[PDB]
Amino acid sequence: PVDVAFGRNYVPTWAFDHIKYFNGGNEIQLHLDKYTGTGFQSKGSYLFGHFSMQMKLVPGDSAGTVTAFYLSSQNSEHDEIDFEFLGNRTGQPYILQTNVFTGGKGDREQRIYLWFDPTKEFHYYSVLWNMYMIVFLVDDVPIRVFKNCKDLGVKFPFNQPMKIYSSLWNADDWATRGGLEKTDWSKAPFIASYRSFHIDGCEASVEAKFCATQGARWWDQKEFQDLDAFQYRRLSWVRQKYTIYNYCTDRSRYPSMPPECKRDRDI
Template sequence: MGVKGVYVMLFLLEITSGVIGGVPRKPIDVPFQKNYVPTWASDHIKYFNGGAEVQLVLDKYSGTGFQSKGEFLFGHFSMRMKMVGGDSAGVVTAFYLSSQTSEHDEIDFEFLGNRTGQPYILQTNVFTGGKGDREQRIYLWFDPTKAYHTYSILWNMRQIVFFVDDVPIRVFKNCKDLGVRFPFNQPMRIYSSLWEADDWATRGGLEKIDWSKAPFVASYTSFHVDACDATTPQKAQICNTRGRMWWDQRAFHDLDGPQYRSLQWVRSKYTIYNYCTDRTRSPTVPPECARDRDI
């Protein structure tokens, strides 16, 4: 391990050992079939150990994806994932929550593949009431193709937090009082997919896929969902009763000091794009950015 790796390990030990509240419950390993079903190209999904591990395959004929069996309103969602290795430029691996209305809400992890030797880019985005354009991009402090890492979302009435291995990398606060819509009344399903970026990649300045490197494989395990079931309107109404679930408790209304310091560490060392500071796109600072401490 190099000097940089030692510093990263020491930092992570410091920030995780100092947390006194607001750490989501530890995910429980469950098989794929408990919470998910394929959505398309099911023949491109491979199962191992009774569904404890799943691989998504992308080739020149098709990608594939899956979704949760139920819909949810608030909770904690996580996957342990290992990204496509080697030359994966033009390949996108997505893990996200989304409602199915015209003014939809969405909470996104998108992993943007790379040429061999270049770092993966992790892009996050939040849509509220159909409005997105809130991209943030970071490099990860590890190689996500070598081993499984945990990617999770905490969603309650106060905030949305993106975590990587329990390290918060982004927070999106409820800024309804500032005129910014927040996801609070549209149940969402969980989705994941492996697909070719194609035109989207070209528009975003990413390189196109090299099909000679196919098939591309992303691996998943630990299909954890700890959330309020909102599959029916009656169930969704119960989910809106605040204060009863662990994620509604005061410890999860905000990040604590050590968590904010770790978030600042990610922003200062690994952030490569933040819509909050993009004056070409937004001549004035979006109102949520100050509350999210993004500026």
């Protein structure tokens, strides 16, 4: 990931005055108070690529807040790849929730705790999205893989260009302790910080759902068809030690377990 200024790749979409720009936009702060949160989105749309953000989450009491960094297509039957950071009362742990929507259908939530305090320093949160798989990374650690399992009849984000989005907003009904902990608005403003703003992707308009260099990109090469053994060991550790919720092993919601799971090593 190469660090660039916000304005190279992104535009604000809501509550422009709630985005504070530092060092020429090399760092931004998103602010949330009782009237409004805020968000931004990429200027371009992409079909496959490598997308990365450095983030430092809301310090102190962040209960009820969600800081999101995600890719989404536009139409109905949408595809989406999500990082959703769920805050907490002071000194209680953040959750990093991930999710994948295909053809308008999600319900693929996983929730992890992190192996560092995400409010203390900036860390990298990244998506690698190619025709074979989607990988979610925290720094150099893969925390989830969503493989292209079209051969098993599972849909995959495959031809809908997506924009990159980020936002900070209240989500009282479900964010903290499943919705039991409500935002304490006397602790506003809640501030999330971002750097890097890295986009390396196959630019593709909604107009045309194609990129003229498809298959010729570095992420289309053979080495990116799968994670290597080292990366899978790091992933298994996240699965065994840091995962508090995993749609794959949730037999109450999925008596009929999803086909991707064994392949993704979420089993």
